[PDB]
Amino acid sequence: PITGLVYDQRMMLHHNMWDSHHPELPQRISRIFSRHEELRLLSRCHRIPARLATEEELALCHSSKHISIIKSSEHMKPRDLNRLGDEYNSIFISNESYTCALLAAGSCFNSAQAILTGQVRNAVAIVRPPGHHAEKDTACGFCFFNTAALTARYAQSITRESLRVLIVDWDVHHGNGTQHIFEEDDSVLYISLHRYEDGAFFPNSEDANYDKVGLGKGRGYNVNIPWNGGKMGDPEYMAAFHHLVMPIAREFAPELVLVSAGFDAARGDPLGGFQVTPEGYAHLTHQLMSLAAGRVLIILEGGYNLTSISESMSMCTSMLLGDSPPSLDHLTPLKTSATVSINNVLRAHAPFWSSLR
Ligand SMILES: NNC(=O)c1ccc(Cn2cc(-c3ccc(N=C4NCCN4)cc3)nn2)cc1
Ligand SMILES: [K+]
Ligand SMILES: [K+]
Ligand SMILES: [Zn+2]
């Protein structure tokens, strides 16, 4: 089997002009890439080139209005960049932002194409800016275009409309954009695990609760696993995979697995407040490799501790390359609040999945 890797230093050019310390730093991707070199993982991978997404590809998920507004930021003066950033929840924009967001999406399209043609078995995309909060009509939470949603649609566009795509989002935040784009769709199964805190955690919406199971023919194809009152870690994520993610995924029988792989649930993240370890991430990756005949694309989303994200994403690539999962030492017993979350999702989804009845 061959593992693809896409990384292009051009995605570093998107930057916060008036807050150089903003957590969504350029060096997130260079630090992840440098860790791959230190661990000698880069020479074991087939390098997939980045490319720009086309406007026609962006229109698979986004409105003409949204594409045109973000495109226009490439030519804006600083005052207009600052004003446009302020139209959105948690966005900064530079004149390089649009091109970086196009490269993040086209990198993922090239990776998906490599996987579906069998040029590679699996792949990792070290990309920024992130994607999962972007909606059809709006940018949000450091995201301009929904890289993972667009990749699922691009995959369907080069195979067949009904190609079965699983998106697993283990970023500590709910992928509100991904959920909304696929809410009525049974061809794309969206499974998110996220800090929820009864709706108080970003992005601050009851849309992220367990009772949002999808709409119309999409009912049962949106799986929210919300965490409340607890610093969740490896035991909680392992229990969620065992009871919910893997049984549902096997029954859906995906032909492609996209991971919205934020590492902001990692031990040491300044924003997440959780304690998933790099070995924890390796175990989750290794379980997803059992789906879709191993056709897994890992796409970087959030994660703001440069050392944590570099160790965590490298451990994931190691698993894609066939290395044995490292053992999980220091497994505390499952938090009560996590058992309740898992039970509530099981009850919400039992009507839709015979593997949960
Ligand atoms: N996947 N989604 C996310 O990861 C995700 C994570 C968070 C948010 C919302 N948001 C924004 C910031 C923020 C922090 C620090 C900051 N700047 C400085 N500089 C000096 C001191 N602090 C500027 C903004 N903190 N929470 C949205 C999406
Ligand atoms: K998530
Ligand atoms: K769906
Ligand atoms: Zn996040």
Residue numbers in the entry: 442 to 798
Paper text:
pmcZinc (Zn)-dependent histone deacetylases (HDACs) are a family of 11 evolutionarily related hydrolases that catalyze the removal of acyl residues from histones, non-histone proteins, and polyamines. HDAC6 stands out among the 11 human isoforms, as being the only one that has two homologous tandem catalytic domains (CD1 and CD2). Furthermore, HDAC6 is mainly localized in the cytoplasm, and its main substrates are various non-histone proteins, such as α-tubulin, Foxp3, Hsp90, β-catenin, cortactin, and peroxiredoxins. By combining kinetics, X-ray crystallography, and mass spectrometry, we found that DFMO derivatives are slow-binding substrate analogs of HDAC6 that undergo an enzyme-catalyzed ring opening reaction, forming a tight and long-lived enzyme–inhibitor complex.
To gain further experimental insight into the mechanism of inhibition of HDAC6 by DFMOs, 1 was cocrystallized with zHDAC6-CD2. Surprisingly, the refined electron density of the bound ligand was not compatible with the inhibitor structure and suggested that a DFMO ring opening reaction had occurred. Several reaction mechanisms were hypothesized, and the resulting substructures were aligned with the experimental electron density map. In this procedure, a hydrazide moiety showed the best fit to the experimental density. In the crystal structure, the hydrazide NH2 group is positioned to share a sp3 lone pair with the metal cation, whereas simultaneously acting as a HB donor with both catalytic key residues His573 and His574. The position of the ZBG carbonyl oxygen atom suggests a HB with Tyr745 rather than a bond with the Zn ion, indicating hydrazide monodenticity. The phenyl substructure directly bound to the ZBG is buried in the crevice made by Phe583 and Phe643, where aromatic rings are interacting through a three-body π–π interaction, whereas the C-H⋯X HB is formed with the methylene substructure and the key residue Ser531 (12, 13, 18). A weak π-alkyl bond is established between triazole and Leu712, whereas the phenyl substructure of the cap interacts with His462 and Pro464. Finally, the apical 2-aminoimidazoline is bound to Asp460 through multiple HBs. When incubated with zHDAC6-CD2, 1 is converted into 2 first and 3 thereafter. Taken together, these data indicate that the complex with 1 itself and the hydrazide 3 observed in the crystal structure are unlikely to be the long-lived enzyme–inhibitor complex detected kinetically.
